[PDB]
Every structure is written in structure tokens, then in C-alpha cells.
């Protein structure tokens, strides 16, 4: 499964995951900025932080 890797405002980078056939994206705004991060798997959705789980390729962008 090929999903994105870049975070925050990085370039369009992807990578193949092994065993894991899922990817998720998490982001959260700060004082005067926005932090973004993606990866494979599906963590727990915590309150205050944005997170999205999907099973689509590069779905975590």
C-alpha cells in the first residue's frame, strides 16, 4: 500500500507499507500555524486533534 509520508507542508512523497493496508492523516492548528502528519495504520481519534482513517492509497494526504 502506497501512501503519503510528507508532513505539515512537505512535498508529495509516498511510500509502500508492509503488512499494514491502511493509512491515516492527522492535523491540528496552533497559535499561528498548522501541524500536519500522515502515516500508515489507524490510531485512536483523540479530542482536540484532527485525524482521519482510510484504506485508500495516498488517502492520507
Swiss-Prot record:
Negative results: does not inhibit GABA(A) channel composed of alpha-1-beta-3-gamma-2 (GABRA1-GABRB3-GABRG2) subunits. It is found in: Secreted. One of its GO terms (molecular function) is acetylcholine receptor inhibitor activity. It comes from Naja oxiana (Central Asian cobra). InterPro entries: Snake_3FTx (IPR003571), Snake_toxin-like_sf (IPR045860), Snake_toxin_con_site (IPR018354), Toxin_cobra-type (IPR054131). It holds the Pfam family Toxin_cobra-type. This is Short neurotoxin 1. Expressed by the venom gland. It comes from the Eukaryota. Binds to muscle nicotinic acetylcholine receptor (nAChR) and inhibit acetylcholine from binding to the receptor, thereby impairing neuromuscular transmission. Keywords: Acetylcholine receptor inhibiting toxin, Disulfide bond, Ion channel impairing toxin, Neurotoxin, Postsynaptic neurotoxin, Secreted, Toxin. Disulfide bonds join 3-23, 17-40, 42-53, 54-59. The keyword Nucleotide-binding does not apply. One of its GO terms (cellular component) is extracellular region. Belongs to the three-finger toxin family. Short-chain subfamily. Type I alpha-neurotoxin sub-subfamily.
